[PDB]
Amino acid sequence: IIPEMRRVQQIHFIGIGGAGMSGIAEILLNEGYQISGSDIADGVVTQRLAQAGAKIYIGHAEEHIEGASVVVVSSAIKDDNPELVTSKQKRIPVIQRAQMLAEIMRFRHGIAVAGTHGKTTTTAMISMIYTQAKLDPTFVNGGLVKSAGKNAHLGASRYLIAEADESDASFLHLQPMVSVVTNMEPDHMDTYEGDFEKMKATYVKFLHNLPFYGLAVMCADDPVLMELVPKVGRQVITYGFSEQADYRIEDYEQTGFQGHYTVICPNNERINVLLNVPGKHNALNATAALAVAKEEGIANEAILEALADFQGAGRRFDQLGEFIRPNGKVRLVDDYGHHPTEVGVTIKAAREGWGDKRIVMIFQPHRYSRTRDLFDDFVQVLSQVDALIMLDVYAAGEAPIVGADSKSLCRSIRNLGKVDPILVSDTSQLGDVLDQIIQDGDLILAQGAGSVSKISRGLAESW
Ligand SMILES: CC(=O)N[C@H]1[C@@H](OP(=O)(O)OP(=O)(O)OC[C@H]2O[C@@H](n3ccc(=O)[nH]c3=O)[C@H](O)[C@@H]2O)O[C@H](CO)[C@@H](O)[C@@H]1O[C@H](C)C(=O)N[C@@H](C)C(=O)O
Ligand SMILES: Nc1ncnc2c1ncn2[C@@H]1O[C@H](COP(=O)(O)OP(=O)(O)NP(=O)(O)O)[C@@H](O)[C@H]1O
Ligand SMILES: [Mn+2]
Ligand SMILES: [Mn+2]
């Protein structure tokens, strides 16, 4: 094996239950490091880590860092966190989540997946292709890979597939061999001082982390990405529906919640793809995945097998089941989409699978900052469903911003006159409210990045 990180005996994670944090912790646990961590919440993730031998503390206290050789910190952690403050006082190395991810990547063949939307999905897809190819990859995904039942896996090969978060610009730590950029739209704009040009510059800097011989795989259908190509200074391979795409998608058809399409490769090789998840957005994600795999020299059959049986990522167009309600049989689908674009493509994918029956949405806005920044776009997109239940903003640690709450969204949606939303501030009433507005054959989308998935789970179990 590769020698242990020098003098690193115990790695302490502040926010260890995190989607990215937990996977990093699990990789290192399985490499033989002592793992400790704290989290304000105990759930399936922390329980799994504890059962595997991680020392897990619920709630934060300065004593929890005892023994730590290094402290890894989620960007969710406040500056005045007692563990964080004490670590700095005691001069224990304190590093970002992504810096520890970078260390996992350092001596590996890193395939980093960046972009505004679809990172978790694309990472899961590449992970499954490489697994299918018998390449035994390590992966660290920012979400549950359904065919793994977990977010991360330690393989014995040198491959690492990893999701690369731009939200705090922390992906600049990463030194990959191949970098995917799925798309670029304004999100997390506070980090970039509301300046989209600073986000662009940051992604260019990220791509400049590639070695001179490294590969950037970028969506041809994104005009921002295409504008940036001259700045990359590394080989760029593109994918998408665009006539100019190196890996070009043609003849896309969605049947039910499966996609069918052809991909045309740079050497004019034609590959007929069956994708086990719906929507053109997922065809894009899967073509990023196919492009990476083809450029790596992976055979078609492995790519196609993995895509045809792709079970998805948790919470990403995730079918929870069918339920017989007093007013009809309904389908409950959970989706992580939290940016207007994501909500949009999800609605469209649902429409192309359902057809005659209604799309009912339970939407929980994530962040006041995001609601403020993209208010008008949310109003437009949320008006495209047939029935809309609005939940209160999931604060995600943010103080309320005036005019950027669910009541304000409801008022503005109501003004458009396409749908009349019902605000459900008391989620214990959600079941009763739904049952009143449910019709036979409804597809219910539980939509958002916050506690909406927990709420939909509790709703599904009660049903
Ligand atoms: C804050 C941030 O940078 N989070 C990104 C990061 O995930 P990470 O593993 O650091 O944590 P996380 O999944 O956000 O969860 C934070 C964890 O810290 C815990 N927590 C939070 C505050 C605190 O004071 N103490 C504490 O212990 C929470 O209980 C939770 O278990 O890397 C992941 C992979 O790249 C990203 O998916 C993830 O986005 C989160 C999930 C997110 O909510 N993203 C969007 C929707 C957003 O914040 O707007
Ligand atoms: N290529 C895409 N373009 C636009 N929306 C997408 C795309 N792929 C997926 N989505 C939508 O975005 C949601 C989140 O997808 P996901 O793969 O988790 O993106 P992400 O980039 O990992 N998000 P995040 O880590 O929170 O910044 C999905 O549930 C879909 O609603
Ligand atoms: Mn993600
Ligand atoms: Mn994001």
Short mmCIF file of C-alpha atoms in Angstrom, two decimals, residues 2-463:
data_model
loop_
_atom_site.label_atom_id
_atom_site.label_comp_id
_atom_site.label_asym_id
_atom_site.label_seq_id
_atom_site.Cartn_x
_atom_site.Cartn_y
_atom_site.Cartn_z
CA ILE A 2 0.76 3.73 0.02
CA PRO A 3 2.31 4.69 3.39
CA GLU A 4 0.05 6.26 6.02
CA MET A 5 -0.17 10.06 6.00
CA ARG A 6 2.77 11.00 8.22
CA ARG A 7 1.95 11.03 11.96
CA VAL A 8 -1.78 10.91 11.20
CA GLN A 9 -3.21 8.60 13.85
CA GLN A 10 -6.67 10.05 14.42
CA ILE A 11 -8.77 12.12 12.06
CA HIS A 12 -11.55 14.15 13.63
CA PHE A 13 -14.50 15.34 11.57
CA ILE A 14 -16.62 18.32 12.62
CA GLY A 15 -19.91 17.64 10.84
CA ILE A 16 -19.18 13.97 10.17
CA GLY A 17 -22.76 13.12 9.15
CA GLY A 18 -22.38 15.36 6.09
CA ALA A 19 -22.97 13.96 2.59
CA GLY A 20 -19.34 14.56 1.62
CA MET A 21 -17.82 14.32 5.10
CA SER A 22 -19.21 10.84 5.84
CA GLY A 23 -17.73 9.32 2.69
CA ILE A 24 -14.31 10.78 3.36
CA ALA A 25 -14.54 9.41 6.92
CA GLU A 26 -15.54 5.96 5.63
CA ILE A 27 -12.66 5.79 3.12
CA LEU A 28 -10.15 6.69 5.84
CA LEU A 29 -11.76 4.35 8.37
CA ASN A 30 -11.33 1.53 5.86
CA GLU A 31 -7.72 2.51 5.15
CA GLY A 32 -7.03 1.88 8.83
CA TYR A 33 -7.12 5.34 10.42
CA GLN A 34 -8.76 6.01 13.76
CA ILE A 35 -11.83 8.13 13.07
CA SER A 36 -13.65 10.45 15.42
CA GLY A 37 -16.30 13.02 14.68
CA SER A 38 -19.09 15.20 15.90
CA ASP A 39 -22.44 16.11 14.42
CA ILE A 40 -25.42 18.04 15.74
CA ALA A 41 -27.70 15.25 14.49
CA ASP A 42 -27.69 11.48 14.89
CA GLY A 43 -29.03 9.52 11.93
CA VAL A 44 -28.45 6.61 9.56
CA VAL A 45 -25.10 8.08 8.45
CA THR A 46 -23.58 8.63 11.92
CA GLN A 47 -24.98 5.31 13.16
CA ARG A 48 -23.37 3.48 10.22
CA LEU A 49 -20.02 5.15 10.92
CA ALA A 50 -20.24 4.38 14.66
CA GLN A 51 -21.06 0.71 13.96
CA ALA A 52 -17.99 0.54 11.70
CA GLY A 53 -15.77 1.78 14.53
CA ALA A 54 -15.78 5.57 14.24
CA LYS A 55 -16.03 7.38 17.57
CA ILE A 56 -19.09 9.59 17.08
CA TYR A 57 -20.24 12.40 19.37
CA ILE A 58 -23.63 14.11 19.03
CA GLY A 59 -23.52 17.83 19.71
CA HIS A 60 -20.34 19.90 19.81
CA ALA A 61 -17.89 20.16 22.72
CA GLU A 62 -14.18 21.00 22.89
CA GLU A 63 -13.38 17.66 24.58
CA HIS A 64 -14.50 15.83 21.40
CA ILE A 65 -11.23 16.67 19.59
CA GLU A 66 -9.13 14.72 22.12
CA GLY A 67 -6.52 12.62 20.31
CA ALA A 68 -7.00 14.24 16.88
CA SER A 69 -3.94 14.45 14.63
CA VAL A 70 -5.94 16.55 12.17
CA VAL A 71 -9.39 18.12 12.18
CA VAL A 72 -11.50 18.05 9.01
CA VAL A 73 -14.28 20.65 8.89
CA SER A 74 -17.52 20.87 6.91
CA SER A 75 -18.30 24.32 5.50
CA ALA A 76 -21.58 23.99 7.45
CA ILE A 77 -19.62 24.51 10.69
CA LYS A 78 -19.73 27.99 12.25
CA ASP A 79 -16.48 29.86 13.03
CA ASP A 80 -17.28 29.78 16.77
CA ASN A 81 -17.75 26.00 16.93
CA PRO A 82 -16.01 24.94 20.18
CA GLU A 83 -14.19 22.03 18.50
CA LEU A 84 -12.98 24.31 15.70
CA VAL A 85 -11.83 27.07 18.08
CA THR A 86 -10.06 24.63 20.44
CA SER A 87 -8.33 22.84 17.54
CA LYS A 88 -6.87 26.14 16.33
CA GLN A 89 -5.83 27.08 19.89
CA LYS A 90 -4.04 23.72 20.28
CA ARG A 91 -2.40 24.11 16.83
CA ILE A 92 -3.89 20.86 15.53
CA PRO A 93 -4.01 21.06 11.72
CA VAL A 94 -7.51 22.18 10.71
CA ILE A 95 -8.49 21.60 7.09
CA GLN A 96 -11.53 21.83 4.84
CA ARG A 97 -13.46 18.74 3.89
CA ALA A 98 -12.23 19.18 0.30
CA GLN A 99 -8.59 19.34 1.41
CA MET A 100 -8.94 15.89 2.94
CA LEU A 101 -10.71 14.79 -0.23
CA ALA A 102 -7.68 16.16 -2.09
CA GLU A 103 -5.42 13.96 0.05
CA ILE A 104 -7.49 10.92 -0.89
CA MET A 105 -7.01 12.04 -4.49
CA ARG A 106 -3.29 12.89 -4.22
CA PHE A 107 -1.83 9.49 -5.15
CA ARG A 108 -4.85 8.32 -7.09
CA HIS A 109 -6.14 8.77 -10.62
CA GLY A 110 -8.75 11.40 -9.82
CA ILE A 111 -11.88 11.95 -11.87
CA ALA A 112 -13.47 15.05 -10.37
CA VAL A 113 -17.06 16.02 -11.16
CA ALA A 114 -17.90 19.72 -10.95
CA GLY A 115 -20.68 21.95 -12.26
CA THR A 116 -23.80 23.61 -10.94
CA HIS A 117 -26.23 20.70 -11.42
CA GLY A 118 -25.87 16.95 -11.81
CA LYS A 119 -22.55 16.36 -10.01
CA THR A 120 -23.88 13.73 -7.60
CA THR A 121 -25.76 12.00 -10.41
CA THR A 122 -22.81 12.03 -12.82
CA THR A 123 -20.41 10.88 -10.08
CA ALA A 124 -22.70 7.93 -9.31
CA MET A 125 -22.86 7.07 -13.02
CA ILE A 126 -19.09 7.17 -13.56
CA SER A 127 -18.61 5.18 -10.34
CA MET A 128 -20.96 2.46 -11.59
CA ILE A 129 -19.37 2.35 -15.07
CA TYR A 130 -15.89 1.93 -13.58
CA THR A 131 -17.25 -0.74 -11.23
CA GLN A 132 -18.88 -2.51 -14.19
CA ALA A 133 -15.59 -2.26 -16.12
CA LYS A 134 -14.03 -4.28 -13.24
CA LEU A 135 -11.70 -1.37 -12.43
CA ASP A 136 -12.55 -1.45 -8.71
CA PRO A 137 -12.69 2.34 -8.22
CA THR A 138 -12.70 4.26 -5.01
CA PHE A 139 -15.50 6.80 -5.06
CA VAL A 140 -16.61 9.65 -2.81
CA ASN A 141 -20.02 10.90 -3.89
CA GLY A 142 -22.00 13.73 -2.28
CA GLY A 143 -25.07 11.52 -2.14
CA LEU A 144 -26.24 7.93 -1.87
CA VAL A 145 -25.26 5.65 -4.74
CA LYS A 146 -28.25 3.29 -4.74
CA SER A 147 -26.33 0.28 -6.14
CA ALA A 148 -23.86 0.72 -3.28
CA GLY A 149 -26.24 1.64 -0.45
CA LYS A 150 -23.72 4.31 0.54
CA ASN A 151 -21.99 7.51 -0.63
CA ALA A 152 -18.43 6.22 -0.84
CA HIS A 153 -16.43 3.05 -1.38
CA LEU A 154 -12.78 2.16 -1.01
CA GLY A 155 -11.50 0.20 -4.00
CA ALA A 156 -8.08 -1.44 -4.36
CA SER A 157 -7.30 0.28 -7.67
CA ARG A 158 -5.79 3.72 -8.10
CA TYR A 159 -9.01 5.24 -9.49
CA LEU A 160 -10.92 7.85 -7.54
CA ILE A 161 -14.24 9.25 -8.70
CA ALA A 162 -15.25 12.23 -6.62
CA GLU A 163 -17.82 14.98 -6.58
CA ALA A 164 -16.19 18.45 -6.45
CA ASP A 165 -18.16 21.18 -4.65
CA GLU A 166 -17.81 24.76 -5.92
CA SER A 167 -20.22 26.23 -3.31
CA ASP A 168 -17.34 27.39 -1.09
CA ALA A 169 -14.75 27.23 -3.90
CA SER A 170 -13.12 24.40 -1.94
CA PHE A 171 -12.73 22.23 -5.04
CA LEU A 172 -9.54 24.23 -5.73
CA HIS A 173 -7.78 21.78 -3.39
CA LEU A 174 -8.35 18.93 -5.83
CA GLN A 175 -5.67 17.71 -8.25
CA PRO A 176 -7.51 15.42 -10.70
CA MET A 177 -6.43 13.64 -13.88
CA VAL A 178 -9.86 14.25 -15.45
CA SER A 179 -12.36 16.97 -14.54
CA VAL A 180 -16.00 17.04 -15.60
CA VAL A 181 -17.91 20.31 -15.66
CA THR A 182 -21.59 19.59 -16.22
CA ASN A 183 -22.87 23.15 -16.54
CA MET A 184 -22.53 26.57 -14.98
CA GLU A 185 -25.36 28.73 -13.69
CA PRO A 186 -25.60 31.16 -10.75
CA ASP A 187 -25.92 29.41 -7.41
CA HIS A 188 -24.08 29.95 -4.10
CA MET A 189 -23.52 33.49 -5.32
CA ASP A 190 -22.67 34.90 -1.86
CA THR A 191 -19.36 32.98 -2.09
CA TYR A 192 -18.63 34.79 -5.35
CA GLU A 193 -19.77 38.21 -4.09
CA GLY A 194 -22.76 38.02 -6.44
CA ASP A 195 -20.34 38.16 -9.38
CA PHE A 196 -20.82 35.38 -11.96
CA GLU A 197 -17.51 36.37 -13.58
CA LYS A 198 -15.78 35.41 -10.31
CA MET A 199 -17.49 32.02 -10.46
CA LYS A 200 -16.27 31.60 -14.06
CA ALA A 201 -12.73 32.57 -13.04
CA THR A 202 -12.86 30.07 -10.17
CA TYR A 203 -13.91 27.21 -12.45
CA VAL A 204 -11.06 28.11 -14.82
CA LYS A 205 -8.64 28.03 -11.86
CA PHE A 206 -10.10 24.64 -10.93
CA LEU A 207 -9.51 23.29 -14.44
CA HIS A 208 -5.96 24.67 -14.32
CA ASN A 209 -5.33 22.14 -11.53
CA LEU A 210 -5.32 19.46 -14.25
CA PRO A 211 -1.84 18.35 -15.33
CA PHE A 212 -0.75 19.64 -18.76
CA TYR A 213 -1.85 16.28 -20.22
CA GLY A 214 -5.10 16.14 -18.23
CA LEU A 215 -8.62 16.13 -19.61
CA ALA A 216 -11.58 18.43 -19.11
CA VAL A 217 -14.97 16.99 -20.04
CA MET A 218 -17.48 19.81 -20.48
CA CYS A 219 -21.10 20.06 -21.61
CA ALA A 220 -21.27 21.38 -25.21
CA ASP A 221 -24.82 22.63 -24.59
CA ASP A 222 -23.74 25.12 -21.95
CA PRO A 223 -22.79 28.44 -23.60
CA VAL A 224 -20.83 29.59 -20.54
CA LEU A 225 -18.70 26.43 -20.64
CA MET A 226 -18.20 26.82 -24.39
CA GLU A 227 -17.19 30.48 -23.98
CA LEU A 228 -14.61 29.36 -21.41
CA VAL A 229 -12.97 26.65 -23.56
CA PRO A 230 -10.14 28.94 -24.89
CA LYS A 231 -9.20 29.71 -21.26
CA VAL A 232 -8.82 26.08 -20.16
CA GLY A 233 -5.41 25.37 -21.72
CA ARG A 234 -5.94 21.62 -21.44
CA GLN A 235 -7.57 19.13 -23.79
CA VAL A 236 -11.32 19.71 -23.73
CA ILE A 237 -13.75 16.97 -24.70
CA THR A 238 -17.39 18.04 -24.99
CA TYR A 239 -20.71 16.22 -24.81
CA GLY A 240 -24.35 17.01 -25.42
CA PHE A 241 -27.05 17.54 -28.01
CA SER A 242 -25.01 20.25 -29.75
CA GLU A 243 -24.00 19.61 -33.35
CA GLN A 244 -20.46 20.56 -32.25
CA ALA A 245 -20.26 18.02 -29.39
CA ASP A 246 -17.39 15.50 -29.39
CA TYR A 247 -19.80 13.02 -27.85
CA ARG A 248 -23.07 13.98 -29.50
CA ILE A 249 -26.51 12.85 -28.32
CA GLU A 250 -29.15 12.17 -30.98
CA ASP A 251 -32.67 10.76 -31.15
CA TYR A 252 -33.48 11.11 -27.45
CA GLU A 253 -36.77 9.49 -26.46
CA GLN A 254 -38.12 9.01 -22.94
CA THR A 255 -40.33 5.96 -22.42
CA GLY A 256 -41.81 5.86 -18.95
CA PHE A 257 -38.83 6.88 -16.84
CA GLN A 258 -36.15 5.41 -19.09
CA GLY A 259 -34.23 7.29 -21.76
CA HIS A 260 -33.23 6.00 -25.20
CA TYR A 261 -30.65 7.73 -27.38
CA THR A 262 -27.61 7.40 -29.60
CA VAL A 263 -24.22 8.89 -28.78
CA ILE A 264 -21.88 9.70 -31.65
CA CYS A 265 -18.21 9.54 -30.64
CA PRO A 266 -15.28 11.63 -32.00
CA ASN A 267 -14.25 8.78 -34.37
CA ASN A 268 -17.88 8.55 -35.59
CA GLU A 269 -18.57 5.47 -33.46
CA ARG A 270 -22.31 5.19 -32.85
CA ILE A 271 -23.46 3.88 -29.46
CA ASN A 272 -27.11 3.11 -28.73
CA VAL A 273 -27.80 3.86 -25.07
CA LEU A 274 -30.55 2.69 -22.75
CA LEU A 275 -30.58 4.87 -19.64
CA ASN A 276 -32.52 3.65 -16.61
CA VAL A 277 -33.31 7.18 -15.42
CA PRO A 278 -35.55 9.81 -17.08
CA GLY A 279 -34.96 13.16 -18.74
CA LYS A 280 -32.60 14.80 -21.18
CA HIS A 281 -30.70 16.22 -18.21
CA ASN A 282 -29.86 12.66 -17.18
CA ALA A 283 -28.87 11.78 -20.76
CA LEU A 284 -26.45 14.69 -20.48
CA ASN A 285 -25.10 13.42 -17.15
CA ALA A 286 -24.80 9.92 -18.60
CA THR A 287 -22.97 11.26 -21.64
CA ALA A 288 -20.46 13.09 -19.45
CA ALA A 289 -20.07 9.66 -17.84
CA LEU A 290 -19.83 7.81 -21.16
CA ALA A 291 -17.31 10.37 -22.50
CA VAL A 292 -15.01 10.00 -19.48
CA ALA A 293 -15.24 6.20 -19.75
CA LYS A 294 -14.60 6.13 -23.51
CA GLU A 295 -11.64 8.52 -23.14
CA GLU A 296 -10.29 6.14 -20.47
CA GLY A 297 -10.57 3.29 -22.96
CA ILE A 298 -13.45 1.47 -21.22
CA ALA A 299 -15.34 -0.95 -23.51
CA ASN A 300 -18.90 -0.13 -24.64
CA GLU A 301 -20.56 -3.11 -22.96
CA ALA A 302 -19.48 -2.02 -19.46
CA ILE A 303 -20.69 1.53 -20.11
CA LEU A 304 -24.00 0.32 -21.52
CA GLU A 305 -24.62 -2.30 -18.82
CA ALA A 306 -24.05 0.27 -16.07
CA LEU A 307 -26.30 2.84 -17.75
CA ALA A 308 -29.08 0.32 -18.53
CA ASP A 309 -29.22 -0.88 -14.93
CA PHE A 310 -28.42 2.49 -13.32
CA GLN A 311 -30.38 2.59 -10.07
CA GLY A 312 -29.80 6.29 -9.51
CA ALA A 313 -28.71 8.37 -6.57
CA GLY A 314 -30.88 8.68 -3.46
CA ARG A 315 -33.35 11.60 -3.50
CA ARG A 316 -32.73 12.18 -7.23
CA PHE A 317 -35.96 11.42 -9.10
CA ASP A 318 -36.24 8.71 -6.45
CA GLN A 319 -39.47 6.70 -6.64
CA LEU A 320 -40.76 6.09 -3.11
CA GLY A 321 -43.70 3.95 -4.26
CA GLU A 322 -47.41 3.89 -5.05
CA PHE A 323 -50.09 4.56 -2.42
CA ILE A 324 -53.87 4.15 -2.39
CA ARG A 325 -55.34 7.31 -0.85
CA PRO A 326 -59.06 7.94 -0.12
CA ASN A 327 -59.18 10.19 -3.22
CA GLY A 328 -57.07 7.96 -5.50
CA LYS A 329 -53.88 6.01 -6.17
CA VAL A 330 -50.80 8.26 -6.19
CA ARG A 331 -47.09 8.00 -6.95
CA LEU A 332 -44.61 9.64 -4.59
CA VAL A 333 -41.27 10.77 -6.02
CA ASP A 334 -38.54 12.52 -4.06
CA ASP A 335 -36.27 14.98 -5.88
CA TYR A 336 -33.30 16.99 -4.66
CA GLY A 337 -33.73 19.78 -7.23
CA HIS A 338 -33.40 23.09 -5.39
CA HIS A 339 -32.39 25.50 -8.17
CA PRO A 340 -35.10 26.68 -10.63
CA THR A 341 -33.32 24.88 -13.50
CA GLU A 342 -33.36 21.58 -11.57
CA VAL A 343 -37.00 21.92 -10.57
CA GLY A 344 -37.70 22.69 -14.24
CA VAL A 345 -36.02 19.63 -15.76
CA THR A 346 -37.55 17.39 -13.08
CA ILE A 347 -41.08 18.64 -13.84
CA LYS A 348 -40.39 18.04 -17.56
CA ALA A 349 -39.04 14.51 -16.99
CA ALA A 350 -42.09 13.72 -14.85
CA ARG A 351 -44.36 15.07 -17.62
CA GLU A 352 -42.67 12.92 -20.28
CA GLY A 353 -43.19 9.81 -18.17
CA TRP A 354 -46.65 10.44 -16.73
CA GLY A 355 -48.59 12.05 -19.59
CA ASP A 356 -52.29 12.24 -18.77
CA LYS A 357 -52.14 12.42 -14.97
CA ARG A 358 -51.21 15.40 -12.79
CA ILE A 359 -47.95 16.66 -11.34
CA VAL A 360 -48.51 17.69 -7.73
CA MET A 361 -45.53 19.31 -6.04
CA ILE A 362 -44.57 19.75 -2.41
CA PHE A 363 -41.82 22.36 -2.64
CA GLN A 364 -39.49 23.36 0.16
CA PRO A 365 -37.20 26.27 -0.77
CA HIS A 366 -33.63 25.77 0.39
CA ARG A 367 -31.93 28.90 1.82
CA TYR A 368 -33.15 32.49 2.06
CA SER A 369 -30.14 33.66 0.05
CA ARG A 370 -31.04 31.35 -2.85
CA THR A 371 -34.72 32.33 -2.67
CA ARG A 372 -33.70 36.02 -2.79
CA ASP A 373 -31.20 35.57 -5.64
CA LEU A 374 -33.48 33.49 -7.89
CA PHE A 375 -36.92 34.64 -6.70
CA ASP A 376 -38.48 35.39 -10.10
CA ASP A 377 -37.18 32.14 -11.61
CA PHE A 378 -38.68 30.12 -8.74
CA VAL A 379 -42.02 31.87 -9.26
CA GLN A 380 -41.96 30.97 -12.96
CA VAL A 381 -40.88 27.35 -12.53
CA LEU A 382 -43.18 26.52 -9.59
CA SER A 383 -46.12 27.79 -11.67
CA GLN A 384 -45.56 24.90 -14.11
CA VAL A 385 -46.99 22.19 -11.83
CA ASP A 386 -50.69 21.29 -11.61
CA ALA A 387 -50.96 21.51 -7.82
CA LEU A 388 -48.50 23.15 -5.45
CA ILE A 389 -47.99 22.73 -1.73
CA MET A 390 -45.38 25.16 -0.45
CA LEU A 391 -43.38 24.43 2.68
CA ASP A 392 -41.55 27.09 4.68
CA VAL A 393 -37.98 27.94 3.67
CA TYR A 394 -35.38 25.45 4.86
CA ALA A 395 -33.00 27.98 6.43
CA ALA A 396 -29.87 25.78 6.27
CA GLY A 397 -28.33 27.94 8.99
CA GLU A 398 -29.36 31.25 7.39
CA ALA A 399 -31.13 34.12 9.12
CA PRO A 400 -34.42 35.04 7.39
CA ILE A 401 -34.20 37.61 4.61
CA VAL A 402 -37.13 39.98 4.21
CA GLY A 403 -39.23 39.18 1.11
CA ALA A 404 -37.34 35.93 0.46
CA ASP A 405 -39.69 33.52 2.26
CA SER A 406 -42.36 31.00 1.22
CA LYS A 407 -45.23 33.42 1.92
CA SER A 408 -43.62 35.87 -0.52
CA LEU A 409 -43.15 33.13 -3.13
CA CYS A 410 -46.79 32.05 -2.73
CA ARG A 411 -48.01 35.64 -3.22
CA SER A 412 -45.96 36.05 -6.41
CA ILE A 413 -46.98 32.63 -7.77
CA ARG A 414 -50.63 33.47 -7.04
CA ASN A 415 -50.17 36.71 -9.00
CA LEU A 416 -49.19 34.76 -12.13
CA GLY A 417 -52.57 33.03 -12.01
CA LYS A 418 -51.45 29.62 -13.31
CA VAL A 419 -51.61 27.75 -9.99
CA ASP A 420 -52.90 28.62 -6.51
CA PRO A 421 -50.34 27.33 -3.98
CA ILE A 422 -51.20 26.13 -0.48
CA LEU A 423 -48.65 27.05 2.19
CA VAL A 424 -48.26 24.30 4.79
CA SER A 425 -46.27 25.77 7.68
CA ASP A 426 -47.33 22.91 9.96
CA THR A 427 -45.99 19.74 8.29
CA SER A 428 -48.07 17.53 10.61
CA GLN A 429 -51.02 18.72 8.51
CA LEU A 430 -49.34 17.88 5.17
CA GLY A 431 -50.94 14.43 4.87
CA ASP A 432 -54.45 15.80 5.41
CA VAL A 433 -53.83 18.75 3.06
CA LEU A 434 -52.55 16.39 0.34
CA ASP A 435 -55.47 13.96 0.74
CA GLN A 436 -57.89 16.85 0.12
CA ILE A 437 -56.15 17.97 -3.10
CA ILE A 438 -55.14 14.51 -4.39
CA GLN A 439 -56.72 13.09 -7.56
CA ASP A 440 -56.48 9.55 -8.97
CA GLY A 441 -53.20 8.85 -10.75
CA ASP A 442 -51.33 11.90 -9.38
CA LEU A 443 -47.55 12.02 -9.45
CA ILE A 444 -46.48 13.79 -6.27
CA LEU A 445 -43.06 15.41 -6.35
CA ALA A 446 -41.50 15.98 -2.95
CA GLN A 447 -39.12 18.69 -4.08
CA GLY A 448 -36.10 20.28 -2.45
CA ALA A 449 -32.71 19.86 -0.83
CA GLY A 450 -33.69 20.21 2.84
CA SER A 451 -35.87 18.26 5.27
CA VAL A 452 -38.53 17.72 2.58
CA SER A 453 -37.14 14.21 1.97
CA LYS A 454 -37.49 13.31 5.66
CA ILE A 455 -41.03 14.72 5.58
CA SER A 456 -41.95 12.74 2.44
CA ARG A 457 -40.49 9.58 4.02
CA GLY A 458 -42.67 10.03 7.12
CA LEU A 459 -45.62 10.62 4.81
CA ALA A 460 -44.88 7.47 2.79
CA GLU A 461 -44.46 5.26 5.87
CA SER A 462 -47.75 6.55 7.32
CA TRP A 463 -49.45 5.73 4.00
#
